[PDB]
RNA sequence: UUAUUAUAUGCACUUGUAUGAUUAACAAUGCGAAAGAUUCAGGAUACCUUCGGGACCCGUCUUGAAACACGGACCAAGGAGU
RNA sequence: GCUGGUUCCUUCCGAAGUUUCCCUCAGGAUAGCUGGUGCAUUUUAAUAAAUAAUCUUAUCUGGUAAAGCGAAU
RNA sequence: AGAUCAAGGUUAUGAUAUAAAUGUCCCAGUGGGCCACUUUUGGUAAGCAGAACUGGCGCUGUGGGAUGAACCAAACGUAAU
RNA sequence: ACCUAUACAUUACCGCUAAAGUAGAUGAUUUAUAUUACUUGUGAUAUAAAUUUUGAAACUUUAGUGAGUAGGAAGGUACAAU
């Protein structure tokens, strides 16, 4: 008739994977984390010192205060319905690095550079993305084994 | 058929002065004409500010008439204030300045005139600077007042500081349980 | 409709690990152009991996059978779903046009077995000459000279007079 | 000293109106010869690729025409939102849509209230000539001449004539987004002869989803 | 009695009526609850920012007091 | 070079076409008619006559009232957010 | 904290039966929803090199459908 | 982590904008809900009981289902076509 | 084929909502004509006649648009007194 409290229904949020138990690999303490960086939260089930609660595992947000061995992240939590900006402290192994900026930061380089090679030829930029267009009009030869190749059913008898 | 236009398609504003004042309801009649035939944005913000209440036309002491003017480089820019210019005794020596205002307290009219500059109604402004060239259109703070000190209040957040509706200031008046960490809790 | 006939050809759009993917074709009876192009994929989602869009529809065309005033008797192979009962059949009709004897199938298969036409699949349609037609209601329409005096009209009821005057005495002999 | 001023205005407004008409003639002449070299090329490419026994696919279609077909009640808040953003809020409203992967997955979502298909030139013309209206600060101004496209769109695009609208829409140009959002959605009326089911797909019954050549023949009886 | 205690019908139609209200995007944000020095250090560097044009060049001449910095590339 | 198109029509003058939400030209019928008095159109005004169509009794509480729920036979005066 | 009533006409907008607490369960307070009244103003405000909400992209998370017992239990 | 200089092309998916942003009056009412697709628990079942989602009824007339609170169409200023 | 809604569409009208325009009238504007500067040509001057207020709390232009209990706001309306 309940949940309440603080770690309920975490038989699979903080379960370990198949055979990734054991000593946490030591790169997790070695990562550098800055202020304003973006970060994910997967609560690591083998470290009880300040897990995120279950309402923040899965959620990304911006660091804005780093300490000795934990980080104070800003995670958007939807309440009803006024989305709040939370201010969560978590440790390091309950955090990963985002990748969602990482593609864009290589798009900022190239749009700086696709205009840089076009700095000399002049024209023209064509910087912004497009979603998938229709392909074109082709024509395709068989050329290579003319048609039929002809699938026709016979699908029951069984 | 179409879903929708709901609401508020009725936009929200005030469109004539609620003062039935026969002097104010004539400066409006003028300044309609000085912003539909000279499309300045200076003259909108006089027609818009001839409309508002007396909250939203807050007083602006004689020192901020002067304290702003002496932010320099315009030594013949008349000071345009859609409201009241009261008097600051904490200013002692007042610079010679030219003032446009709806109302001027007489202890400020006796001082500006003595310096001596001008005091202008808003029809002498428009007959002098219709487009507002060389003017300084100011307004005192709309939340200067103390009705605004009480907006809005959860004790439980670390940021409220917002002033109950008590009857009286003292101990044994809302000072005990829920304010002190001994009695009850600290809010 | 009347179920025209098409020949609809597929592609598997050509992603770089394999260009030139191998171009299968079908023979489709549909009432219209664009529903022929969606029978094709329902009948591609059983034989090849290949869906849309992982594939294309390269040139289709509507075909216009060869001899529209010969009196060939078709024999169609068929697969259909019952209330409980996906079944093979094999049916035969006489028609001048091929898509006239697939639509002859549908309005008969749909009547005699209740067979709604989304649970019928055509798995062969060919002209079958004579002396291979089994199907007794075909091979009684074979023997020239066939005499058959079924004095037949619709005998339009009644005619341009509702309250007629003349009592229409059908036989007229 | 006024009558000197106005009759120089009045004779330079004449020379600019004269220098639009010829510049909107030979511009409609150039745009028309495109739509003859285009469709004759696709005849030329097929009568080529037959004799070389290749398969000539034609081009996949950009430019749909999307028309709300069915009903303003009982609709769910994610088909409620796509059909707002397609500007299709009434029954028998239609907008022009550029087709990519990113709106086709939106026509998939709003699929049971939409019939669509890819329009003829005659359909592009007859929709802006007979039914075609225009946004002048949220107002629905009709056409009545081609000053009313020359006003808002010649200075910041190069559309000035009515056939420049048709050219920027049949050949889905760089200013497509400006010249579909210029046109207020086409409040068509109810097709004479009718619909078929309105609420079974076009492949089954006949309405919603891609008709894909037969938006032309529907729009005949709708416009 | 027992008809309807604790339902969620009409609860996201309400929460999507005066709608779902993203927070903000504030240029500056509160440093309330940050590391408390850290912030006293940045409150000391904020006061000592004195050179806009004047001393900011000058200390390069002081780098040349060791003819530059050949040695300290290590630590 | 084969074609195609536009520009090179001012001065007068029309009962001319367009465009100012593009309806107006022709006829017929009949006289506001001195007071006196007809013609043509219209009038579910508030009813009676004739037909067609629709059409359950209000107020209330209620998830749901025409309800086999409660109040109300009818009428004038009074009568409840200061 | 319950029953009954609560007297003009048009015009505009238009709900809730949920949350937390209560000797609370036919009631309140409380937030959500509502109207009013403003105000500030944008090359998404008045003669955009920037916001905002369904798809796309990119990237995180999940242990239900299906699958499994010739993997653990 | 900041404070001022130097360089920067065409502003960096699509389609949308019936205006959006924000205070106050946290002002009125409400805090008995019922119905339905798909999901679902108790019960043997129930026009029963209890939840998740979306849409409706409540508040809503009109067209259709002879008939009907919720079904299917469709949402409603006075009229012609 | 065809019949059928208070839906769709084009039009008239009512409201709403959102924009936009108008106030030198000892001025503006016509039509002619006398004179004229003359620029060929078009303006400026004299004459004769003509049109040209609006509770600007008004008038004019344009577009979209209309469900509603509980409930709130605006504008009217009946009664009686100062």
PDB file of N, CA and C in Angstrom, chain C residues 94-158:
ATOM      1  N   UNK C  94     -13.468 -18.969 -66.353  1.00  0.00           N
ATOM      2  CA  UNK C  94     -13.345 -18.637 -67.756  1.00  0.00           C
ATOM      3  C   UNK C  94     -13.475 -17.139 -67.873  1.00  0.00           C
ATOM      4  N   UNK C  95     -12.503 -16.504 -68.509  1.00  0.00           N
ATOM      5  CA  UNK C  95     -12.565 -15.068 -68.693  1.00  0.00           C
ATOM      6  C   UNK C  95     -11.642 -14.687 -69.820  1.00  0.00           C
ATOM      7  N   UNK C  96     -11.901 -13.534 -70.398  1.00  0.00           N
ATOM      8  CA  UNK C  96     -11.060 -13.052 -71.471  1.00  0.00           C
ATOM      9  C   UNK C  96      -9.774 -12.460 -70.932  1.00  0.00           C
ATOM     10  N   UNK C  97      -9.831 -11.832 -69.763  1.00  0.00           N
ATOM     11  CA  UNK C  97      -8.722 -11.100 -69.178  1.00  0.00           C
ATOM     12  C   UNK C  97      -8.330 -11.685 -67.835  1.00  0.00           C
ATOM     13  N   UNK C  98      -7.027 -11.653 -67.551  1.00  0.00           N
ATOM     14  CA  UNK C  98      -6.459 -12.299 -66.367  1.00  0.00           C
ATOM     15  C   UNK C  98      -6.923 -11.634 -65.087  1.00  0.00           C
ATOM     16  N   UNK C  99      -6.804 -10.316 -65.021  1.00  0.00           N
ATOM     17  CA  UNK C  99      -7.379  -9.571 -63.930  1.00  0.00           C
ATOM     18  C   UNK C  99      -8.883  -9.545 -63.916  1.00  0.00           C
ATOM     19  N   UNK C 100      -9.533 -10.087 -64.930  1.00  0.00           N
ATOM     20  CA  UNK C 100     -10.943 -10.331 -64.812  1.00  0.00           C
ATOM     21  C   UNK C 100     -11.254 -11.669 -64.214  1.00  0.00           C
ATOM     22  N   UNK C 101     -10.300 -12.578 -64.221  1.00  0.00           N
ATOM     23  CA  UNK C 101     -10.515 -13.833 -63.551  1.00  0.00           C
ATOM     24  C   UNK C 101      -9.747 -13.949 -62.263  1.00  0.00           C
ATOM     25  N   UNK C 102      -9.103 -12.889 -61.808  1.00  0.00           N
ATOM     26  CA  UNK C 102      -8.796 -12.806 -60.390  1.00  0.00           C
ATOM     27  C   UNK C 102      -9.920 -12.107 -59.651  1.00  0.00           C
ATOM     28  N   UNK C 103     -10.501 -11.065 -60.231  1.00  0.00           N
ATOM     29  CA  UNK C 103     -11.679 -10.491 -59.610  1.00  0.00           C
ATOM     30  C   UNK C 103     -12.895 -11.374 -59.749  1.00  0.00           C
ATOM     31  N   UNK C 104     -12.876 -12.341 -60.645  1.00  0.00           N
ATOM     32  CA  UNK C 104     -13.921 -13.333 -60.642  1.00  0.00           C
ATOM     33  C   UNK C 104     -13.728 -14.265 -59.485  1.00  0.00           C
ATOM     34  N   UNK C 105     -12.490 -14.456 -59.075  1.00  0.00           N
ATOM     35  CA  UNK C 105     -12.244 -15.301 -57.928  1.00  0.00           C
ATOM     36  C   UNK C 105     -12.754 -14.640 -56.662  1.00  0.00           C
ATOM     37  N   UNK C 106     -12.498 -13.349 -56.505  1.00  0.00           N
ATOM     38  CA  UNK C 106     -12.676 -12.715 -55.211  1.00  0.00           C
ATOM     39  C   UNK C 106     -14.132 -12.635 -54.853  1.00  0.00           C
ATOM     40  N   UNK C 107     -14.963 -12.387 -55.824  1.00  0.00           N
ATOM     41  CA  UNK C 107     -16.361 -12.172 -55.528  1.00  0.00           C
ATOM     42  C   UNK C 107     -17.072 -13.486 -55.371  1.00  0.00           C
ATOM     43  N   UNK C 108     -16.500 -14.547 -55.925  1.00  0.00           N
ATOM     44  CA  UNK C 108     -16.893 -15.921 -55.674  1.00  0.00           C
ATOM     45  C   UNK C 108     -16.277 -16.517 -54.425  1.00  0.00           C
ATOM     46  N   UNK C 109     -14.971 -16.366 -54.226  1.00  0.00           N
ATOM     47  CA  UNK C 109     -14.361 -16.868 -53.005  1.00  0.00           C
ATOM     48  C   UNK C 109     -14.926 -16.158 -51.795  1.00  0.00           C
ATOM     49  N   UNK C 110     -15.197 -14.867 -51.914  1.00  0.00           N
ATOM     50  CA  UNK C 110     -15.761 -14.132 -50.809  1.00  0.00           C
ATOM     51  C   UNK C 110     -17.186 -14.492 -50.497  1.00  0.00           C
ATOM     52  N   UNK C 111     -17.934 -14.986 -51.477  1.00  0.00           N
ATOM     53  CA  UNK C 111     -19.322 -15.375 -51.254  1.00  0.00           C
ATOM     54  C   UNK C 111     -19.443 -16.774 -50.709  1.00  0.00           C
ATOM     55  N   UNK C 112     -18.729 -17.694 -51.325  1.00  0.00           N
ATOM     56  CA  UNK C 112     -18.910 -19.092 -51.045  1.00  0.00           C
ATOM     57  C   UNK C 112     -18.220 -19.528 -49.781  1.00  0.00           C
ATOM     58  N   UNK C 113     -17.264 -18.764 -49.260  1.00  0.00           N
ATOM     59  CA  UNK C 113     -16.541 -19.153 -48.052  1.00  0.00           C
ATOM     60  C   UNK C 113     -16.388 -18.062 -47.016  1.00  0.00           C
ATOM     61  N   UNK C 114     -16.873 -16.870 -47.298  1.00  0.00           N
ATOM     62  CA  UNK C 114     -16.963 -15.686 -46.461  1.00  0.00           C
ATOM     63  C   UNK C 114     -15.634 -14.982 -46.184  1.00  0.00           C
ATOM     64  N   UNK C 115     -14.483 -15.612 -46.392  1.00  0.00           N
ATOM     65  CA  UNK C 115     -13.313 -15.122 -47.117  1.00  0.00           C
ATOM     66  C   UNK C 115     -13.139 -13.634 -47.368  1.00  0.00           C
ATOM     67  N   UNK C 116     -12.965 -12.791 -46.361  1.00  0.00           N
ATOM     68  CA  UNK C 116     -12.701 -11.389 -46.658  1.00  0.00           C
ATOM     69  C   UNK C 116     -11.311 -11.246 -47.240  1.00  0.00           C
ATOM     70  N   UNK C 117     -11.198 -10.449 -48.284  1.00  0.00           N
ATOM     71  CA  UNK C 117     -10.112 -10.353 -49.251  1.00  0.00           C
ATOM     72  C   UNK C 117      -8.905  -9.889 -48.725  1.00  0.00           C
ATOM     73  N   UNK C 118      -8.709  -9.712 -47.435  1.00  0.00           N
ATOM     74  CA  UNK C 118      -7.403  -9.502 -46.857  1.00  0.00           C
ATOM     75  C   UNK C 118      -6.805 -10.786 -46.374  1.00  0.00           C
ATOM     76  N   UNK C 119      -7.547 -11.868 -46.452  1.00  0.00           N
ATOM     77  CA  UNK C 119      -7.074 -13.165 -46.027  1.00  0.00           C
ATOM     78  C   UNK C 119      -7.162 -14.124 -47.185  1.00  0.00           C
ATOM     79  N   UNK C 120      -6.882 -13.608 -48.360  1.00  0.00           N
ATOM     80  CA  UNK C 120      -6.706 -14.381 -49.572  1.00  0.00           C
ATOM     81  C   UNK C 120      -5.360 -13.970 -50.132  1.00  0.00           C
ATOM     82  N   UNK C 121      -4.593 -14.925 -50.617  1.00  0.00           N
ATOM     83  CA  UNK C 121      -3.333 -14.617 -51.248  1.00  0.00           C
ATOM     84  C   UNK C 121      -3.281 -15.364 -52.552  1.00  0.00           C
ATOM     85  N   UNK C 122      -2.862 -14.695 -53.599  1.00  0.00           N
ATOM     86  CA  UNK C 122      -2.700 -15.324 -54.896  1.00  0.00           C
ATOM     87  C   UNK C 122      -1.296 -15.897 -54.969  1.00  0.00           C
ATOM     88  N   UNK C 123      -1.183 -17.187 -55.249  1.00  0.00           N
ATOM     89  CA  UNK C 123       0.111 -17.849 -55.238  1.00  0.00           C
ATOM     90  C   UNK C 123       0.484 -18.445 -56.573  1.00  0.00           C
ATOM     91  N   UNK C 124      -0.402 -18.389 -57.572  1.00  0.00           N
ATOM     92  CA  UNK C 124      -0.157 -18.635 -58.990  1.00  0.00           C
ATOM     93  C   UNK C 124      -1.420 -18.307 -59.737  1.00  0.00           C
ATOM     94  N   UNK C 125      -1.289 -17.753 -60.928  1.00  0.00           N
ATOM     95  CA  UNK C 125      -2.415 -17.558 -61.829  1.00  0.00           C
ATOM     96  C   UNK C 125      -1.898 -17.843 -63.222  1.00  0.00           C
ATOM     97  N   UNK C 126      -2.501 -18.802 -63.903  1.00  0.00           N
ATOM     98  CA  UNK C 126      -2.046 -19.127 -65.231  1.00  0.00           C
ATOM     99  C   UNK C 126      -3.266 -19.496 -66.044  1.00  0.00           C
ATOM    100  N   UNK C 127      -3.153 -19.383 -67.355  1.00  0.00           N
ATOM    101  CA  UNK C 127      -4.143 -19.937 -68.263  1.00  0.00           C
ATOM    102  C   UNK C 127      -3.895 -21.423 -68.409  1.00  0.00           C
ATOM    103  N   UNK C 128      -4.940 -22.208 -68.250  1.00  0.00           N
ATOM    104  CA  UNK C 128      -4.863 -23.656 -68.331  1.00  0.00           C
ATOM    105  C   UNK C 128      -5.701 -24.076 -69.526  1.00  0.00           C
ATOM    106  N   UNK C 129      -5.150 -24.808 -70.482  1.00  0.00           N
ATOM    107  CA  UNK C 129      -5.689 -24.781 -71.844  1.00  0.00           C
ATOM    108  C   UNK C 129      -7.072 -25.369 -72.054  1.00  0.00           C
ATOM    109  N   UNK C 130      -7.193 -26.667 -71.833  1.00  0.00           N
ATOM    110  CA  UNK C 130      -8.365 -27.523 -71.819  1.00  0.00           C
ATOM    111  C   UNK C 130      -7.759 -28.880 -71.549  1.00  0.00           C
ATOM    112  N   UNK C 131      -8.593 -29.835 -71.148  1.00  0.00           N
ATOM    113  CA  UNK C 131      -8.178 -31.183 -70.754  1.00  0.00           C
ATOM    114  C   UNK C 131      -7.141 -31.178 -69.637  1.00  0.00           C
ATOM    115  N   UNK C 132      -7.077 -30.085 -68.881  1.00  0.00           N
ATOM    116  CA  UNK C 132      -6.414 -30.005 -67.601  1.00  0.00           C
ATOM    117  C   UNK C 132      -7.282 -29.302 -66.579  1.00  0.00           C
ATOM    118  N   UNK C 133      -8.263 -28.534 -67.026  1.00  0.00           N
ATOM    119  CA  UNK C 133      -9.292 -27.933 -66.196  1.00  0.00           C
ATOM    120  C   UNK C 133     -10.062 -29.017 -65.466  1.00  0.00           C
ATOM    121  N   UNK C 134     -10.103 -28.978 -64.135  1.00  0.00           N
ATOM    122  CA  UNK C 134     -10.831 -30.069 -63.515  1.00  0.00           C
ATOM    123  C   UNK C 134     -12.303 -29.765 -63.278  1.00  0.00           C
ATOM    124  N   UNK C 135     -12.638 -29.109 -62.165  1.00  0.00           N
ATOM    125  CA  UNK C 135     -13.668 -28.085 -61.959  1.00  0.00           C
ATOM    126  C   UNK C 135     -14.870 -28.133 -62.890  1.00  0.00           C
ATOM    127  N   UNK C 136     -15.812 -29.039 -62.612  1.00  0.00           N
ATOM    128  CA  UNK C 136     -16.955 -29.389 -63.462  1.00  0.00           C
ATOM    129  C   UNK C 136     -17.727 -28.210 -64.048  1.00  0.00           C
ATOM    130  N   UNK C 137     -17.771 -27.066 -63.379  1.00  0.00           N
ATOM    131  CA  UNK C 137     -18.533 -25.970 -63.957  1.00  0.00           C
ATOM    132  C   UNK C 137     -17.780 -25.234 -65.038  1.00  0.00           C
ATOM    133  N   UNK C 138     -16.502 -25.511 -65.224  1.00  0.00           N
ATOM    134  CA  UNK C 138     -15.805 -25.019 -66.394  1.00  0.00           C
ATOM    135  C   UNK C 138     -16.038 -25.928 -67.572  1.00  0.00           C
ATOM    136  N   UNK C 139     -15.712 -27.204 -67.417  1.00  0.00           N
ATOM    137  CA  UNK C 139     -15.686 -28.150 -68.519  1.00  0.00           C
ATOM    138  C   UNK C 139     -17.052 -28.627 -68.937  1.00  0.00           C
ATOM    139  N   UNK C 140     -18.117 -27.963 -68.542  1.00  0.00           N
ATOM    140  CA  UNK C 140     -19.352 -28.110 -69.273  1.00  0.00           C
ATOM    141  C   UNK C 140     -19.532 -26.996 -70.263  1.00  0.00           C
ATOM    142  N   UNK C 141     -18.710 -25.956 -70.169  1.00  0.00           N
ATOM    143  CA  UNK C 141     -18.717 -24.863 -71.123  1.00  0.00           C
ATOM    144  C   UNK C 141     -17.670 -25.051 -72.170  1.00  0.00           C
ATOM    145  N   UNK C 142     -17.397 -26.292 -72.528  1.00  0.00           N
ATOM    146  CA  UNK C 142     -16.374 -26.606 -73.497  1.00  0.00           C
ATOM    147  C   UNK C 142     -16.908 -27.013 -74.853  1.00  0.00           C
ATOM    148  N   UNK C 143     -17.958 -27.816 -74.889  1.00  0.00           N
ATOM    149  CA  UNK C 143     -18.246 -28.621 -76.063  1.00  0.00           C
ATOM    150  C   UNK C 143     -19.008 -27.831 -77.106  1.00  0.00           C
ATOM    151  N   UNK C 144     -18.273 -27.267 -78.055  1.00  0.00           N
ATOM    152  CA  UNK C 144     -18.867 -26.840 -79.308  1.00  0.00           C
ATOM    153  C   UNK C 144     -19.274 -28.085 -80.043  1.00  0.00           C
ATOM    154  N   UNK C 145     -20.488 -28.126 -80.565  1.00  0.00           N
ATOM    155  CA  UNK C 145     -21.477 -27.067 -80.548  1.00  0.00           C
ATOM    156  C   UNK C 145     -22.307 -27.152 -79.299  1.00  0.00           C
ATOM    157  N   UNK C 146     -22.454 -26.046 -78.589  1.00  0.00           N
ATOM    158  CA  UNK C 146     -23.124 -26.029 -77.299  1.00  0.00           C
ATOM    159  C   UNK C 146     -24.480 -25.365 -77.493  1.00  0.00           C
ATOM    160  N   UNK C 147     -25.554 -26.105 -77.243  1.00  0.00           N
ATOM    161  CA  UNK C 147     -26.824 -25.639 -77.782  1.00  0.00           C
ATOM    162  C   UNK C 147     -27.503 -24.646 -76.846  1.00  0.00           C
ATOM    163  N   UNK C 148     -27.957 -25.094 -75.654  1.00  0.00           N
ATOM    164  CA  UNK C 148     -28.220 -24.244 -74.489  1.00  0.00           C
ATOM    165  C   UNK C 148     -29.253 -23.135 -74.756  1.00  0.00           C
ATOM    166  N   UNK C 149     -30.499 -23.427 -74.772  1.00  0.00           N
ATOM    167  CA  UNK C 149     -31.518 -22.426 -75.081  1.00  0.00           C
ATOM    168  C   UNK C 149     -32.041 -21.696 -73.893  1.00  0.00           C
ATOM    169  N   UNK C 150     -31.157 -21.296 -73.005  1.00  0.00           N
ATOM    170  CA  UNK C 150     -31.686 -20.545 -71.881  1.00  0.00           C
ATOM    171  C   UNK C 150     -32.050 -19.194 -72.419  1.00  0.00           C
ATOM    172  N   UNK C 151     -33.329 -19.134 -72.664  1.00  0.00           N
ATOM    173  CA  UNK C 151     -34.023 -17.958 -73.053  1.00  0.00           C
ATOM    174  C   UNK C 151     -33.679 -17.062 -71.886  1.00  0.00           C
ATOM    175  N   UNK C 152     -32.841 -16.053 -72.141  1.00  0.00           N
ATOM    176  CA  UNK C 152     -32.337 -15.223 -71.055  1.00  0.00           C
ATOM    177  C   UNK C 152     -32.424 -13.756 -71.424  1.00  0.00           C
ATOM    178  N   UNK C 153     -32.991 -12.980 -70.498  1.00  0.00           N
ATOM    179  CA  UNK C 153     -32.723 -11.558 -70.320  1.00  0.00           C
ATOM    180  C   UNK C 153     -32.486 -11.268 -68.838  1.00  0.00           C
ATOM    181  N   UNK C 154     -32.482  -9.983 -68.471  1.00  0.00           N
ATOM    182  CA  UNK C 154     -32.797  -9.602 -67.095  1.00  0.00           C
ATOM    183  C   UNK C 154     -34.297  -9.520 -66.980  1.00  0.00           C
ATOM    184  N   UNK C 155     -34.964  -9.299 -68.103  1.00  0.00           N
ATOM    185  CA  UNK C 155     -36.361  -8.984 -68.183  1.00  0.00           C
ATOM    186  C   UNK C 155     -36.658  -7.847 -67.222  1.00  0.00           C
ATOM    187  N   UNK C 156     -36.147  -6.672 -67.626  1.00  0.00           N
ATOM    188  CA  UNK C 156     -36.229  -5.432 -66.881  1.00  0.00           C
ATOM    189  C   UNK C 156     -37.596  -5.294 -66.266  1.00  0.00           C
ATOM    190  N   UNK C 157     -37.639  -5.203 -64.966  1.00  0.00           N
ATOM    191  CA  UNK C 157     -38.906  -5.056 -64.286  1.00  0.00           C
ATOM    192  C   UNK C 157     -39.106  -3.576 -64.052  1.00  0.00           C
ATOM    193  N   UNK C 158     -40.284  -3.081 -64.398  1.00  0.00           N
ATOM    194  CA  UNK C 158     -41.156  -3.759 -65.344  1.00  0.00           C
ATOM    195  C   UNK C 158     -40.999  -3.172 -66.733  1.00  0.00           C
TER     196      UNK C 158
END
